[PDB]
Design an enzyme around this catalytic site. Structure first.
Site, mmCIF file in Angstrom:
data_model
loop_
_atom_site.group_PDB
_atom_site.id
_atom_site.type_symbol
_atom_site.label_atom_id
_atom_site.label_comp_id
_atom_site.label_asym_id
_atom_site.label_seq_id
_atom_site.Cartn_x
_atom_site.Cartn_y
_atom_site.Cartn_z
ATOM 1 N N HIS A 1 -5.355 -6.957 -0.806
ATOM 2 C CA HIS A 1 -4.774 -7.313 0.314
ATOM 3 C C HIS A 1 -5.092 -8.621 1.653
ATOM 4 O O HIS A 1 -4.717 -7.375 2.426
ATOM 5 C CB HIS A 1 -5.117 -5.520 0.633
ATOM 6 N N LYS B 1 4.753 -3.458 -8.370
ATOM 7 C CA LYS B 1 4.070 -2.414 -6.713
ATOM 8 C C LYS B 1 5.308 -2.549 -6.293
ATOM 9 O O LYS B 1 5.473 -3.732 -5.969
ATOM 10 C CB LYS B 1 2.891 -3.405 -6.690
ATOM 11 N N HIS C 1 -8.813 1.139 0.093
ATOM 12 C CA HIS C 1 -7.544 1.038 0.279
ATOM 13 C C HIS C 1 -6.748 0.468 0.828
ATOM 14 O O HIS C 1 -7.414 0.908 2.423
ATOM 15 C CB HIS C 1 -7.386 2.284 -0.227
ATOM 16 N N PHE C 2 -5.741 0.503 1.426
ATOM 17 C CA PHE C 2 -5.166 -0.306 2.155
ATOM 18 C C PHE C 2 -4.406 0.943 3.194
ATOM 19 O O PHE C 2 -3.260 1.680 2.092
ATOM 20 C CB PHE C 2 -4.040 -1.131 2.398
ATOM 21 N N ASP C 3 -4.013 2.273 3.523
ATOM 22 C CA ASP C 3 -3.636 3.099 4.035
ATOM 23 C C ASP C 3 -2.094 3.003 4.380
ATOM 24 O O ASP C 3 -1.195 3.899 3.992
ATOM 25 C CB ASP C 3 -4.332 3.885 4.573
HETATM 26 O O1 LIG Z 1 1.797 0.155 4.485
HETATM 27 C C1 LIG Z 1 1.453 0.061 3.378
HETATM 28 C C2 LIG Z 1 1.126 1.409 2.939
HETATM 29 C C3 LIG Z 1 0.716 1.438 1.853
HETATM 30 N N1 LIG Z 1 0.232 0.384 0.854
HETATM 31 C C4 LIG Z 1 -0.811 0.568 -0.039
HETATM 32 C C5 LIG Z 1 -1.611 -0.009 -1.105
HETATM 33 C C6 LIG Z 1 -2.353 1.205 -1.313
HETATM 34 N N2 LIG Z 1 -3.828 0.363 -2.007
HETATM 35 C C7 LIG Z 1 -5.260 1.041 -1.941
HETATM 36 O O2 LIG Z 1 -5.562 -0.167 -3.164
HETATM 37 C C8 LIG Z 1 -4.932 0.272 -4.325
HETATM 38 C C9 LIG Z 1 -6.212 0.474 -5.453
HETATM 39 O O3 LIG Z 1 -5.415 -0.040 -7.262
HETATM 40 C C10 LIG Z 1 -3.916 1.349 -4.844
HETATM 41 O O4 LIG Z 1 -3.138 1.286 -4.951
HETATM 42 C C11 LIG Z 1 -4.636 2.461 -2.981
HETATM 43 O O5 LIG Z 1 -5.260 3.162 -2.876
HETATM 44 N N3 LIG Z 1 -3.232 -0.711 -2.054
HETATM 45 N N4 LIG Z 1 -2.053 -0.786 -1.778
HETATM 46 C C12 LIG Z 1 0.326 -0.914 1.869
HETATM 47 O O6 LIG Z 1 -0.468 -1.653 0.599
HETATM 48 N N5 LIG Z 1 0.511 -0.684 2.770
#
Ligand SMILES: O=c1ccn(Cc2cn([C@@H]3O[C@@H](CO)[C@H](O)[C@H]3O)nn2)c(=O)[nH]1
Length: 124
Positions: free
Chosen positions: A12, A41, A119-121
């Site tokens: 991220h 992904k 995590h990115f929510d």
């Molecule tokens: O607008 C968004 C909405 C969701 N996400 C998902 C995400 C979550 N994560 C967190 O860390 C990862 C660790 O494996 C998991 O998929 C999630 O908890 N990574 N991607 C976005 O990137 N952008």
């Protein structure tokens, strides 16, 4: 082994560019950050602010996570981000993405000591 904090940074964080993400950006970044290794992904967001600024979000506005947990935080200021969304014609291993730059408030889940993003929510 890779910590959850490190995994968040790999998935991220992209402080290196301000936004300027070409139309190619997600195709390249999803591959290089190893988010296309096992499958494509489907959705992933990169944040173009400093690691300090993103870590700071864990002490900002507490909001409910999408999964119902209480450990999510929304940035007070908008942040430069790029959303990557798998195209309809994308077929693993040749993962293909639409690249969309935005300035939005990020919502991250934080855990641990130190309390850091894991995590990115969402972005709002
Ligand atoms: O607008 C968004 C909405 C969701 N996400 C998902 C995400 C979550 N994560 C967190 O860390 C990862 C660790 O494996 C998991 O998929 C999630 O908890 N990574 N991607 C976005 O990137 N952008």
């Amino acid at each position: 082994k890779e910590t959850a904090a490190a995994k968040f940074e790999r998935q991220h964080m992209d402080s290196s560019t301000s936004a300027a993400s070409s139309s190619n950006y997600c195709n390249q970044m999803m591959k290089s950050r190893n988010l296309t290794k096992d499958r494509c992904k489907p959705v992933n967001t990169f944040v173009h602010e400093s690691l300090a600024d993103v870590q700071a979000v864990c002490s900002q506005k507490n909001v409910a996570c999408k999964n119902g947990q209480t450990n999510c935080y929304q940035s007070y200021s908008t942040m430069s981000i790029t959303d990557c969304r798998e195209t309809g014609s994308s077929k693993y291993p040749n993962c293909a993405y639409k690249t969309t730059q935005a300035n939005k408030h990020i919502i991250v889940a934080c855990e641990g000591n130190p309390y850091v993003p894991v995590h990115f929510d969402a972005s709002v």
